[PDB]
Amino acid sequence: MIKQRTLKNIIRATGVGLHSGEKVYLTLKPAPVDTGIVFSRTDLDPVVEIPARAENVGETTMSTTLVKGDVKVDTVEHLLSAMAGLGIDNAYVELSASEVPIMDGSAGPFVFLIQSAGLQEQEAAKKFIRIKREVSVEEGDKRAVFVPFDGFKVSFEIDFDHPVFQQASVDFSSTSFVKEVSRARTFGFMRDIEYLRSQNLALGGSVENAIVVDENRVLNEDGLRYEDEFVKHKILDAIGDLYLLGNSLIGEFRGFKSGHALNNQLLRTLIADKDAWEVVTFEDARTAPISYMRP
Numbered sequence: 628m629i630k631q632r633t634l635k636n637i638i639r640a641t642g643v644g645l646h647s648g649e650k651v652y653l654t655l656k657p658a659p660v661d662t663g664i665v666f667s668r669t670d671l672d673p674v675v676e677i678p679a680r681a682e683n684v685g686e687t688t689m690s691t692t693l694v695k696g697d698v699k700v701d702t703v704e705h706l707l708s709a710m711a712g713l714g715i716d717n718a719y720v721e722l723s724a725s726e727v728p729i730m731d732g733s734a735g736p737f738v739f740l741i742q743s744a745g746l747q748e749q750e751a752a753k754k755f756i757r758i759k760r761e762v763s764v765e766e767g768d769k770r771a772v773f774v775p776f777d778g779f780k781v782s783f784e785i786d787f788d789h790p791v792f793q794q795a796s797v798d799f800s801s802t803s804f805v806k807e808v809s810r811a812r813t814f815g816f817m818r819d820i821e822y823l824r825s826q827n828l829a830l831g832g833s834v835e836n837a838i839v840v841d842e843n844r845v846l847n848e849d850g851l852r853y854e855d856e857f858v859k860h861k862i863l864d865a866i867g868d869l870y871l872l873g874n875s876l877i878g879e880f881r882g883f884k885s886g887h888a889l890n891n892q893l894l895r896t897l898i899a900d901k902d903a904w905e906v907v908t909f910e911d912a913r914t915a916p917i918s919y920m921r922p
């Protein structure tokens with residue numbers, strides 16, 4: 628059977644908020660069966676806990692933000708992506724400030740820390756959300772779609788009018804999340820980055836945690852990790868946003884110029900349309916359409 632997973636040991640990391648520029652201490656802890664991923668602002672007294680679910684999504688401009696009243700947890704998507712890629716169902720994520728650390732801009736450092744700590748299978752079946760009808764949302768020239776598929780695959784297509792250039796498809800029957808997606812970094816363009824900074828955003832961004840692009844080229848001295856790094860990172864972002872469903876997907880995602888906002892609308896519409904999905908478990912791992920690496 629495919630079993631739920633938590634962390635075997637706690638993970639501690641420190642780093643900086645991409646947007647706030649604040650220093651943040653992060654802890655991932657084990658959690659019980661059916662907890663989900665829950666973020667906790669431990670700098671506050673009392674502590675404010677915000678389940679990583681679609682209904683708690685507040686701000687969707689330049690990152691995915693979770694909100695409960697006037698308290699926020701910003702930039703959850705890269706860490707969530709790491710957790711979906713490793714099959715982590717249950718975990719507490721404690722943060723000493725409002726924003727998850729950006730690390731090197733990718734999910735790589737989070738996956739390494741997690742896998743160094745190890746995972747723990749738990750004695751309860753892993754629940755999956757299986758797409759049974761096509762669900763599509765559009766706004767302007769952006770589109771995001773779920774399609775029935777016996778496995779898990781993601782496609783993204785961006786239309787950037789810029790010299791540095793994209794589309795990519797990843798099916799997890801052959802693509803390795805760890806080797807081919809997790810290392811793809813955050814990116815931004817100089818004119819936007821300075822707009823953002825002028826609006827008190829992007830305060831922690833630097834070549835240390837992002838691919839920085841001027842009008843023509845990548846300015847990072849050591850260049851790119853993958854030739855299609857930009858689009859691979861969008862796939863990473865989409866994986867994190869989709870994990871806000873609260874369970875892993877059995878289906879296909881296709882994004883066409885979609886960001887955090889549209890991804891969140893897609894999740895909302897799916898949740899609402901209860902004929903388009905059902906919760907399934909696999910009591911025999913041997914016959915399941917997906918598999919996970921050893922814990």
Ligand SMILES: C[C@H](O)c1nccn1Cc1cc(-c2ccc(C#C[C@@H]3[C@H]4CN(CCCC(=O)O)C[C@@H]34)cc2)on1
Nearest residue numbers: 645689690704813814815820829832833834837839864
């Ligand atoms: C998070 C979301 O999931 C997401 N993933 C993918 C994309 N995004 C959106 C996103 C990207 C960014 C973002 C913000 C800032 C920077 C940057 C930057 C460095 C600063 C400092 N540098 C100065 C160098 C010159 C000198 O040496 O003096 C140049 C410039 C890059 C990217 O913010 N939001």
Ligand SMILES: [Zn+2]
Nearest residue numbers: 704813860864
């Ligand atoms: Zn991102």
